[model samples]
Target chain A: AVERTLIIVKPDAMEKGALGKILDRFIQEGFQIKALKMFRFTPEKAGEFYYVHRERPFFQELVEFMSSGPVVAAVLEGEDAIKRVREIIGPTDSEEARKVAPNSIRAQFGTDKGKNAIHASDSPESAQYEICFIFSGLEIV
Target chain B: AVERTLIIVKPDAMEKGALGKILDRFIQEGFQIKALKMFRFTPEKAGEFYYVHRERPFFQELVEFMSSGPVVAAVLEGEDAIKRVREIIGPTDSEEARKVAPNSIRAQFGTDKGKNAIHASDSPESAQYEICFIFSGLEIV
Candidate 1:
């Protein structure tokens, strides 16, 4: 079996029409595109999915942004998919990404803080929860 | 500003685990990912998606396989995307693909006649309807 992870082409990218370029980075970096779909999030769903961040000051803003428009959700599978996709996206903040990893997806397509172009689950455990949450009702095998 | 086309990473490639490498080639060759999603086709959905081929002998087999499992459906954007993606996938026949375009997606990953690993829209007009049928309820722009 392959290691799998979830990637969200966030609303910012959706708004800017950067979905293709961002996906280009993942595919070019060798992560397999296992599952993918475009979805619109309800505030309740976005809130629950990011529940761990609920206590954070940015929680509400995060949920609002995520629910604002359609997102491209996908599952990438391969060896070290979690880590590899993370590396390809660079830092969470576009400014930081630009300074440290100019060639990364964030640097090239993301806009600003909380407006990053993509989101990837940080760990395999998190990925399992997320792949289920996003791809609801589908058999993961 | 870019032309767009749809491509399906059919069940065989999904089973064989070539999704990532196959997408890699398209991205590397300068295509852009627009809309992407994983979907299961009902027999009805499959019949309509391949409606033009319904009169052919292979139509039944096509619909059955298409609806058999989950598939990755995507919109790729670029200049001359329809023609370009067709070139990348090579002929519908795997053996023909192997001989004439050994470097192509079907040649590298496909199994047989109708079990070929990928499907690309043959023209812009067909792509419009196919994209709508598969990505129903979404604004393509």
Candidate 2:
């Protein structure tokens, strides 16, 4: 079945000038971009978006890092997109990803767990919520 | 001085799966992406966007073509971006572009004049207007 997922080229990746390269990988993998935009997150907004991790110790740092620079967000569609995207991005810890999924985005660009180079929705439910959170209904074509 | 310009990956190019490669070219040329999105034009919207050519006989056909499928629009910033981007996309006629500028985007992916692979603002004035027409201030990062 066809599915949609949200992906964020995180601030660290953007700062490293990897936005286009990261996007190209998805397109090369057969995902059709449904929506896309470049925007900076406000601290409050970032906090709210990562609210599910509110109880975590690193939540505040993640929020701060996300709001530190511009980010490119996109909604991509394909077969099993959510799972496929996560696989492409690899594990959250950049260092671990390098050992496990050496070809992954994080492995190539990320500094660490907090500065992971990209974000992909972990599940279908999150994909729906995250896509809506970042894009208006009309924005998705 | 740094400048910005609007670019559109036209429907034909999008259908041919050239979006990622097209964007990579700009990034490779040192342009920084400021905003991007995918959307289909309504016939009326397409008509208004190409209003500068309204008096021309091909205007109606251009509008119909623009509204034919999904297009990706972006704002790119760099030194002399307006002129540089226009140069990168090459001439208006794909056949001519291939003969004159063999490596240009239009030369590689475009079919003809009406289905040229991409659009880039030709001047500073048009860039400002075109960028604003498709993107809100908050969208640029």
RMSD vs true structure, all candidates: 5.1, 1.4
Q: For residues A4-104, what per-residue lDDT tens digits would candidate 2 score against the true structure?
A: 99999998888777887888888889999888878889999999889899999999899999999888889999999999999999999999999999999
How big a share of the true inter-chain contacts is recovered in candidate 2? 0.60
> What residue pairs are clashing in model 1?
A20-B33, A32-B20, A36-B37, A36-B38, A37-B37
Question: With candidate 1 superimposed using the best TM-score fit, by how many Å does residue B37's alpha carbon deviate from the native?
Answer: 1.0
Residue A119, model 2: lDDT of 92
Give the number of the best model, judged by DockQ: 2
**Share of reference contacts found in each model:** 0.22, 0.60
Residue pairs clashing in model 2 are: none
Q: Best by TM-score, which number?
A: 2
Predictions' DockQ, in order: 0.22, 0.64
Candidate 2 lDDT, B1-141, residue by residue in tens: 899999999999998888878988888899988888788999999998888989999999999999998899999999999999999999999999999999999999899999999999989998998999899988887
